[model samples]
Target chain A: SKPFTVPILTVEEMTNSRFPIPLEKLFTGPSGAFVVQPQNGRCTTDGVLLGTTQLSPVNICTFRGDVTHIAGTHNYTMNLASQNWNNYDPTEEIPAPLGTPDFVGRIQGMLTQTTRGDGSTRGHKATVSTGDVHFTPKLGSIQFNTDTNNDFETGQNTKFTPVGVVQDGNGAHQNEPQQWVLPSYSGRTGHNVHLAPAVAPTFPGEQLLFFRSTMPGCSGYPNMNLDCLLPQEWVQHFYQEAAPAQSDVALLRFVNPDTGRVLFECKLHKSGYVTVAHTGQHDLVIPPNGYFRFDSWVNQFYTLAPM
Target chain B: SKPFTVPILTVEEMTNSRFPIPLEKLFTGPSGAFVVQPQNGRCTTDGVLLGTTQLSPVNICTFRGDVTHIAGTHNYTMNLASQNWNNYDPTEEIPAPLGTPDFVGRIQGMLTQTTRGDGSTRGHKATVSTGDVHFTPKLGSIQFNTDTNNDFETGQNTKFTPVGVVQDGNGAHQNEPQQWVLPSYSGRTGHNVHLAPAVAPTFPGEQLLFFRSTMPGCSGYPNMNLDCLLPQEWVQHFYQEAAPAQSDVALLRFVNPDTGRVLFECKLHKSGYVTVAHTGQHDLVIPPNGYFRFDSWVNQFYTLAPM
Candidate 1:
């Protein structure tokens, strides 16, 4: 909003009497002088002055009439009338009270403008004054459909599309799905299997599926040759029939080929679907070309899959 | 609690004169109208009046007796006394002073009552009036062994039975037992058999024996015609002699039927039972009539049993 100013009124009175009069004799009148008196039961705009005067038989008296600057009931009344003039309705003519000749001030309304991203502007308007001061009102500026990519920009004007709201770990809005890919495995000579670098799931609730085919084919199969022909076929067949219909059938096991110790075991459903069940204690890690084995009947019978 | 009332007092006076006189001439007593004055230093039941009066001389003057209806030192004194009387100890008698007659008022104390659900009431006592108003106290009602099913009812008093507590999905009280029923097989026609629903072992840490004969019997030597007499006998014999003293023999498999997927597999023992562990994912589930299989063998073999 923009600000505007209003004119103020000032009234001045001077009293110069030839004869001495009692202090109580002064009252509100041309000849009586503007009398300032102590408040009694109620305040009066005009009353007789009662306190003892400093000047014996008071002769000269003066009143500078800016209600805003003076301290008296009469001055307060004048100030209130001036404020009303600046705050009157714009549609109606300013009312001029009798005896208040210097009551002069213009009432102006505040204005506001809004600029949209489409380069369109809209204006809002209001009256311009408080009881004590005059000012123009201007509403805040609003922009729509505008790019606010820079740090200096106030805010973004881009359209927001709503979707199914999901909460994150801290109950905050989760705008994107979590992603993690299972590591790949490559074949090694003898009974060894080499595991490739892969992103492990971090959150306990996060999961990922790595197709067995994505792993190296078994080292031996129908033939003793390292380039086994049936190992790949076995893996394909396993994938085709290994989609777990229920939760129980999705289990899979990871083992050390030499000791036959179960390194890590968990369920694997349709696509090597491995879910991160527990964290802190159970974080599965398979280094690049790390030797390990996938225990499965298809792998066992076809290429002597690591038990 | 019940309400009670207190008493009040009043005093009156009159003045008569032969000629008009200034009202200010009258002070506290005798010739002048008995006047009330501002309290000085301390309050007094009777005191001389001070300060000048605006009224001109009067032929007669009077003051009403009711302290509650008038304002003055005498009236104030009477009102203060009445307040003290109401707030004083109820068992004590009200003190009556001389000369100030008709200073009459009664003091009453509040009473309380307590009622129980059994239709018995107990009386609780006391408090004198507060300023001017009086009220009684009532204690909350108590009930014993009553059914309060409606929402507006106070509460219930049923005796609660103690039981083992279990956790639910959100970890709240899961009062019911976690039941998993074991499946049974009944021969239909020929060698074909039908399975029946049987209760599974509960208690996460509890272990149960799974007789190997419970599985589908071999067609020939193990037993033929579904009746498989020897298979039943083998089951009985295994129950009698197959209790494993070691962990190696108790192996369980959770499999998917349609795709022949082994979802989860674990071992169980006497002191420590292996859980089908993946926490955030892969919880096991068994549906009705879902084709599935279990593979197990008796730790000790006998004549009727085929390994």
Candidate 2:
């Protein structure tokens, strides 16, 4: 692309309707010639461009790029002083290849205006009657419109909002949600590091969410029901910690989330280094919408969802 | 430095000193041309040189390099059939540069040799009284002498051993015995990874061995009594773990190595996030030869020694 030739337009000049050049002449043709204003009105830094607009009383235009805010505000200005009008001849009152003229509306009645204490000038607005024939201005692919408040003129509160939901190539919204699958610890048999769940599980099925090994084998593997291999000294220390209050008992209980009542309870083991086993009878089952909470002797908790 | 010209010698040929040429003529001079043999009687691999020997019945010579064992036995052979004997003139009956000859003792009386079941031929034993005069041979920097077992001759059962203590630059023996000063967790305050005591400390003192942060604060700093910044969730988890059993305690104790008696003891707190403050009372002090041992609520232990 060629370099921009316009020398930027001031907020006051851009807002003035009596200005010699209109916003339509800001660009050379359908391509090139745009203005950039820096945040906080800083001329030294590159700014966002006020994009091309359609013929609307509101000055509608589409934002082209990301517009960032600094210090809780996005303040900027535009420069459109020296745009190249190569497509239009200056000597001709009517340029060649012109069809029906796009409408530029104006207020017909005189209006009384006064500067308010808020540094804004207000004019008593009145509507003017026009012909019944209406012309709809063709809009560019991306466009925006101006407001009477001059906020858009000064680039103060003009936010470039996303128009529609961004979709993936599969025609699904990019942020579409999915079900969470509880991570299994079976593959972490020989690794030294293990991560405990940072948050409690929230699912609707009775599932074995997490398991801690206390001995030397994978629990879920076929014919292998041993706990993980812990250091001998650590195992001995766990036994020592288990001796006193019988507090080392692995407990399973479900408390009501709303009322905090123990709906079910079972003491899985009374000693250290015990494994969880299922008996054909007396299996701890969670009802629909309910969950099972398992607490290990060493202060690890796991929540199983109800099926 | 010159290329070796000696033909390889077999283990059997090297062991038999009376085969033809003596083993003393294997080297060109005191510098080079030597090969090592393995412990077994094999001719497939090169063997270590038994080294040059002066006129002595004991077969005394210095070893030059490292001797390594392969397959629990280094089996090898020597190449000595072709040697450049340019240093000695073959035509002369007596070399002019020759000094006094050292004695090569032999058994007196008629000797009958017989091959034994051990694959070695034995000579009939005979002994005779010898003269009192002794001649000392010039020795190389590194040398070895062999006995009658023919172990070094056949490159069997010959092992190089370390002689003296390897010492540091300070003239102290490198393997000097010292007291074990178990490391404490005093310096690891904010670091994520901390190293345990792999080696004993080499300092003197009844120091503040280990300090657990009861509150926020760095130990040994001027006005910074603050615990390190931890994850808020982790702190909450620690609080939760500390709730029920009141088990959040840091215990310090030292057991007597000789009697297994508790030498010192100090209990820091019953809850997590506590701090240690200086109490002017009878503070837990380590007596001479006593050390401090710290047990964390988690499965970690640290030891500190008293001067």
Candidate 3:
């Protein structure tokens, strides 16, 4: 019935909210000419995380210009930053980001936008038509609602752009990693922004360790098998960034310090995502610094022992 | 020298800063009444991280009112929040922060503030006197400069409030674990704001795991022994919050699941702080949910095995 107003988060508000947010890209799902802000937060002109902060198009899927009607066509900007993170070994340049977005593509569609709430809630949600602008090539299909956020400033709803583990229209999917930068329930950015469209539960004897920051929220609960809940505008920061290549899933050997090689090599989908699939035992080969979150299922069966 | 205009960090910039910052409290050196901010960031009114964001006085050592002179005495509101963080087991109430300060101590000290730079840099530092706040009672003395920050808006030099593992003037140091909140080089808040005043290196077989969110920044280098450098006002988040009791440094037993008995007793100064000193071998015992950063010295000798 009305537009929603967003609130800025404080250092205390974040790390210690009454509510726990899940990885937005885990298909936990959002709107706008908005780009991805960090999970930690993006502030307003004053230094706040209110739903009323002005929107700045950073990169993801946003209109190149402006849109007037609730339903019409406009140029959409699909943007992303370059990948330079190394979880195992790091260099000064390992996480160094480039000035401009590393990837940007133009697309047009019959964009539809909407607002359907009373407007004065922290994370009140109602279904609305917002940004659903792109379709990545060879991406899988998964059914889930994008997390919604209140844009009290622009009067827009926070949204989720269709992201792919494999970039769209790229000539070689094998050459790149799944690196997208879009917003979550809050329109703020952080890690796991680029969620795989369709992800399956790990196969029998297989383990899953997709990149995520808040899996512990569901530690002892059986619902760990289901999607976890988070309020709008919060983020799931990445604890590690040892991204995998687009190369096919392969056997990763767990070499012991005493022996040069090990008997069994675990089957792993290097970048476990929606479309990427692999099978085999749950043998894990974690580097000294590899801290990708382990699936709840993965937690019960295997124990991580550092070499 | 030109003034240091703090730069807002991009997610790219922070996860991969060209110049890594040490935990500001590691006795890293600062100027202003500006309270403690987060390590992830603090933004201006705009939705970006920058040096110029107006400072808000969250709980820390902030002048109850503003001071105009370089040096003078004023009423200071020493603020802190009621903490409820759980690294091992969290409830809906865990990390759920109350809106107001749980502990507010009034202190009057000879305050000397400074701003020694011209006015355009990300993290330039000059030894200026800002906030050398309340000295904790019976707190050990450590000699290191507080991390400095800039206020492009207030034009105040950011500062460090002398915090104690034990609250100032509080009766029993035995009933509290070190819990302090302050800012880094960026005026942003995060974990490790309240640092111990004088921390000695862990003894021969004793392992040290202070509550820190960023020890990986110094992984691999021998200089891990030296304090790492972060830009002005950034933060050092806390990964684990299994804080120790304020009781005397005691013996911890490592329990074996199969044997159901103690394998060996390890010496630990739980919630290790600068003021708390104990001696023993580096025997280590970490809980399954515990992930306090391991000292570089501790890492070479022990291995982390998840039970």
For lDDT, candidate 1 versus 3, the one ahead is 3
Per prediction, fnat is 0.00, 0.00, 0.00
CAPRI quality of model 2: incorrect
A114-181 per-residue lDDT for model 2 (tens digits): 11222121111111111111111111011122112222223211212111111123432212111021
lDDT: worst 10-residue window of model 1 chain B: B5-14
TM-score of each: 0.12, 0.17, 0.23
lDDT of 2 at B267: 36
Top TM-score hit: 3
Best by DockQ: 3
lDDT of 1 by residue, B1-307 (tens): 1111100100000111111110011111111221111011110101111111101111001011111111221111111111112221222221111001110111111111111242111111111111111111001011111111221112211111100111123322221121121111011121211111112223342222221111111011111000010111111112223334332224445445556666445433222212222222221343322221224432422111100
Local lDDT at A177 for model 1: 18
RMSD of 3: 23.1
Q: Candidate 2 at A179: error in angstroms?
A: 26
lDDT of 3 by residue, A1-307 (tens): 1111112232223221111112212221221222322222222211233211111111222221111222222222222212221221112121112111112221111121222232221111111112132322111111112122222213333222111111122243222221233222212122222222322344433333322322111001111111211112222221122222333333333333344444233333332221112333222333332212222122223423211
